[PDB]
Amino acid sequence: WNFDPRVEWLMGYLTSHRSQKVLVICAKAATALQLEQVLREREGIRAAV
Amino acid sequence: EFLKPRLVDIEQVSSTHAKVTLEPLERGFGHTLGNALRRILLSSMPGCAVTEVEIDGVLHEYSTKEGVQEDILEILLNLKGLAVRVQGKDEVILTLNKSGIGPVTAADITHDGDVEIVKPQHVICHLTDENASISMRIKVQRGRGYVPASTRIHSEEDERPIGRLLVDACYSPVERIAYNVEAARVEQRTDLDKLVIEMETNGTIDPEEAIRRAATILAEQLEAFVDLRDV
Amino acid sequence: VLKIVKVYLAVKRRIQPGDKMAGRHGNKGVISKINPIEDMPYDENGTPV
């Protein structure tokens, strides 16, 4: 979750559209937990799984 | 039938210390202008300074890194003194990455175009281990006055990243101001005075621009005063 | 008692009006006002007290 450019794009878009609710779809729950952890520990984004 | 002051020679003794002279000042306006400028300079000069810092291996201000001897708080204290000139943008992100034994000074910052690091010799840290490495990203803003972290906490605006370390902002470049009004023998006049403004700054604002901006602000407010409705 | 969890909070308190300050000779006082830099007295050289 440090070099995959998709994550940086997601963060950048969210931090640039902070006033928008965004629905993000992934395949499996494990990847969703990793995404919550990275958005929290490096941008503090509130995300429910 | 009046006189009016013209900006004359501006001696620069050092990079930080400067003398500015104003020759043709009418009697009595010497002290008035001296004090007004001193006030405006000390109070209202806009500058840029670091607002918050994120270092990698550190959760909070009070922990400690391996291979450094200063505490993190002292690192913030060192960052508070960094004198920087930003030209175009309002918020810049500087990146510091250094490894190995040595003093990490301000010079090691990655050289960007729009940002000028005034004092590259300014020390930041001392490493003590070959494999010890520090990386950090310092966010620098423009502002006026003095704003501490704790007041801005009301307006957090998603301070959510726990890695964020807020620093108090001293948005003011001028350290010291003195002035002397002394007799200015003008070839066709008896009793005229010249004002000499001696100024000490952190080396970001140039003297000419400081004086011009101060005069601008004072003239604008005085303009606001000139009209009186009485309606 | 099954178990206990202790948590330490650290808080940075800055000086503000109303705190008590003293000297070594028995002189006391309450900090009454924070003045702007410009208002404070200054010697000819420009250093404020």
Swiss-Prot record, chain A:
Ranges in a coiled coil: none
Stated family: Belongs to the SNF2/RAD54 helicase family. RapA subfamily.
Function: Transcription regulator that activates transcription by stimulating RNA polymerase (RNAP) recycling in case of stress conditions such as supercoiled DNA or high salt concentrations. Probably acts by releasing the RNAP, when it is trapped or immobilized on tightly supercoiled DNA. Does not activate transcription on linear DNA. Probably not involved in DNA repair.
Quaternary structure annotation from Swiss-Prot or TrEMBL: Interacts with the RNAP. Has a higher affinity for the core RNAP than for the holoenzyme. Its ATPase activity is stimulated by binding to RNAP.
The protein's name in its UniProt record: RNA polymerase-associated protein RapA
Organism from which the protein derives: Escherichia coli (strain K12)
This protein's encoding gene: rapA
Residues represented out of the complete protein: 485 to 533 of 968
